[PDB]
Amino acid sequence: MNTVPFTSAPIEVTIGIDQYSFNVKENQPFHGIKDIPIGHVHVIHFQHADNSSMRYGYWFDCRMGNFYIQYDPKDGLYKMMEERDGAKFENIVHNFKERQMMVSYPKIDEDDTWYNLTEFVQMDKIRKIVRKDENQFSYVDSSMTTVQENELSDPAHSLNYTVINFKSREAIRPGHEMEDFLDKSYYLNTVMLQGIFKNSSNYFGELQFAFLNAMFFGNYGSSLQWHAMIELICSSATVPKHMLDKLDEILYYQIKTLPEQYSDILLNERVWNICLYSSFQKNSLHNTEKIMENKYPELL
Amino acid sequence: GAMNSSNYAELFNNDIKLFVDDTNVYRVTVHKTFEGNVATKAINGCIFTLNPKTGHLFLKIIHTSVWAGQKRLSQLAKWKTAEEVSALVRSLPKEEQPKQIIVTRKAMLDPLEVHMLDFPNIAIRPTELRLPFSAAMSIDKLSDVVMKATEPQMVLFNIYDDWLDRISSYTAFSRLTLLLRALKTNEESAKMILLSDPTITIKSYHLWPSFTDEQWITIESQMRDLILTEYGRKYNV
Ligand SMILES: OCc1ccc(OC(F)F)cc1
């Protein structure tokens, strides 16, 4: 179990850790989050009480260092930082844990939700999508745009997701125009899986990370990327059997965890209706189709 | 964006553009089998690719052999159209290639767009106009060359005959769309109008009769009357 301590909480803010969240009052004596499960990435995130604009947060992995938050009154946000000094930090955390000034990562032991949403998400891949090599953790917010969004403006603050575009030369083999546009298996399996991602695990990891950035920060370009990566699989007639079974589990837990009141903006009608009812894989997503029908039959 | 009443004069400016109509590419007669079921038999078709400024018509004849052993033909027809239009553009010299292609049916947008990925600078556009180019097979010389074809074949025509020696492109296109709209609503009557006076002939190198300016005014009037009536004879007014 690991700990991300907080120097203080000078402004009223809603703090999330993974799918959990709690309200902190202005200058409330809040000094961090303990009992964080080791072995998974995590995201700490923030929504100020006064400017519901800008959800922002930090992806991190406690195996990669000792991380903590401190409010910067100049830039006006809670910043994650790394502490080089290991016993100064263990001093800080122990003193805090003794004054019981920390919240406990509130995992139900039966609950595998976080594992299921982050199964293929690795910090190394996150750090390639969110480029900032001087830090072991990654900042994301509501307003950041993707590489592909920039193409159609500040690259230092971009989300460098893999560009997918169904009406592109990368996607359509000269001479197979109709074949490749109606059956994307070429683009999925040869171009993306074999060529770009190398394996389905790295593909699933980017899919999962895009979903989580859409859900936690309302990042529109991430939502576009999540839907694109689903649509590429569902529109391929030939998908490895293990990928299809795993996709069903992945999507299931994403739809399960989505706020019931955010389904209007974060879910794309066209993509989901094609994937569950028209595409090659209309019959290979039983768990995802079942939960989508019982929980969002309006969309459909 | 889409082409409509409001940007109609863009057709006659000096940017090369083509209309592409696919309505006559896949043509069938539907009949009964000995068992009493229904089968289609395909007949030859054509892509109707038209430069509205110059009257140049690229009539790509689609031979029935194209369809042998293929499934979902009406879908394939749209992709076959797009393959042939892309081949046509690649065959033209660069200074003759269009800057825009306007498809008369919106289902041709993605097929053409994907076949033209090599031509990022050629804009593929739909239209809100209900153009009557389906009636091109009511022009006898065009129908004849399509039905007689024994193999794939491109045939070049000027759909305006010599009209551009006396009228503008705008005026020539309006005459053409009036003639085709009339042939589309009531072919027999339209064809009667065009041939009633045996002394006016169709030149061997033309599609339409050799009308004087005064005779075109009378003809065009008769075509308008026809279109309004058939619209009465249809909705009773
Ligand atoms: O001065 C650097 C430093 C300050 C505070 C720390 O704990 C913070 F989490 F509460 C750790 C390091």
CA B178 centroid distance within chain: 13
**Is the C-beta atom of A89 inside 6 A of ligand 1?**
yes
Q: What is the CATH number of the domain that holds A239?
A: 1.25.40.550
Taking a C-beta distance cutoff of 8 angstroms, is the pair A236, A74 a contact? no
Closest CA to A251 of A286, A283, A222: A286
Contacts of B128 (CB under 8 A, 6+ apart): B2, B3, B4, B5
Torsion, Cα A120 A125 A131 A136, to 10 degrees, reads 90
Cβ-based contacts of B83 with chain A (< 8 Å)? 177
Range list for CATH 1.20.80.40 in chain B = 164-237
φ, ψ for residue B102 (rounded to 5)?
-105, 120
Resolution (A): 1.6
Q: Do A177 and B76 touch (CB under 8 A)?
A: no
Looking at residue A226, its amino acid is W
How far apart are the C-alpha atoms of A46 and A40, rounded to whole Å?
Answer: 20
Q: Which of A168, A169, A177 lies nearest to residue B79, judging by beta carbons?
A: A177
Under DSSP, is residue A300 helix (H, G, I), strand (E, B) or coil?
coil
- For ligand 1, atom 6, name the residue with the nearest CA: A7
Q: Do B114 and A181 touch (CB under 8 A)?
A: yes
How many CB contacts within 8 angstroms connect chain A with chain B? 21
Instruction: List the single best residue of A178, A235, A270 to mutate versus B (max B Cβ within 10 A).
Output: A178
State which H helix or E strand residue A125 sits in: helix A123-129
Facing residues of B59 across strands? B48, B155
Q: Do A177 and B110 touch (CB under 8 A)?
A: no
B164-237: CATH homologous superfamily? Prp8 RNase H domain, fingers region (1.20.80.40)
How far apart are the C-alpha atoms of A2 and B124, rounded to whole Å?
Answer: 57
CA distance B157 to chain A (A): 29
State which H helix or E strand residue A141 sits in: strand A138-141
Range list for CATH 3.30.420.230 in chain B = 9-163
Which is it for strands A32-36 and A103-104: parallel, antiparallel or unpaired? Answer: parallel
Give the torsion sign (CA, A82, A87, A88, A89). Answer: positive
Facing residues of B158 across strands? B56
CA distances in angstroms from A1 to A17, A34, A60, A105, listed in the order given: 14, 7, 14, 9
Q: Do A178 and B79 touch (CB under 8 A)?
A: yes
DSSP string, B65-105: GGGTT-SSHHHHHHHHHHHHHHHHHHHS-GGGS-SEEEESS
In our burial notation (b when 16+ CB lie closer than 10 A, e otherwise), range B44-64 reads bbbbbbbbbbebbbbbbbbbe
Biggest CA-to-CA distance, chain A = 70
How far apart are the C-alpha atoms of A261 and A242, rounded to whole Å?
Answer: 32
B9-163: CATH homologous superfamily? Prp8 RNase H domain, palm region (3.30.420.230)
**Is the C-beta atom of A187 inside 6 A of ligand 1?**
no
Number of helical H runs and strand E runs in chain A: 12, 10
Contacts of B214 (CB under 8 A, 6+ apart): none
Residue A197 has what DSSP assignment? I
Closest CA to A206 of A184, A229, A224, A190: A229
- For ligand 1, atom 4, name the residue with the nearest CA: A7
Cβ-based contacts of A178 with chain B (< 8 Å)? 76, 79, 111, 114
Distance B19 CA to ligand 1 centre (A): 69
Give the torsion sign (CA, A202, A203, A206, A212). Answer: negative
DSSP string, chain B: --B-GGGGGGGGSSS-EEEEE-TTSSEEEEEE-TTS-EEEEEE-EEEEEE-TTT-EEEEEEE-GGGGTT-SSHHHHHHHHHHHHHHHHHHHS-GGGS-SEEEESSGGGHHHHHHHTTT-TTSEEE-BSS---GGGGGGSHHHHHHHHH-SS-EEEEEETTTTGGGTS-HHHHHHHHHHHHHHHHH-HHHHHHHHHSSTTS---TT-SS----HHHHHHHHHHHHHHHHHHHHHHH--
Facing residues of A197 across strands? none
Q: Do B114 and A172 touch (CB under 8 A)?
A: yes
- For ligand 1, atom 2, name the residue with the nearest CA: A83
Interface residue ranges in chain B relative to chain A, Cβ cutoff 8 Å: 76, 79, 82-83, 110-111, 113-115, 117-118
Enclosing domain of residue A249: 116-296
CB atoms within 10 A of CB B160: 25
Atom of ligand 1 minimally distant from the CA of A8: 10
**Is the C-beta atom of A92 inside 6 A of ligand 1?**
yes
Tokens for A49, please give them.
Answer: 């009480």
Give the torsion sign (CA, A284, A285, A289, A291). Answer: positive
Secondary structure string (H, E, C) spanning A236-252: CCCCCHHHHHHHHHHHH
How far apart are the C-alpha atoms of A116 and A103, rounded to whole Å?
Answer: 23
Tokens for A168, please give them.
Answer: 């592109």
CA A66 centroid distance within chain: 22
How far apart are the C-alpha atoms of A121 and A159, rounded to whole Å?
Answer: 15
Tokens for A152, please give them.
Answer: 């159609």
φ, ψ for residue B195 (rounded to 5)?
-125, 10
Q: Do A177 and B113 touch (CB under 8 A)?
A: no
φ, ψ for residue B103 (rounded to 5)?
-90, 135
State which H helix or E strand residue A32 sits in: strand A32-36
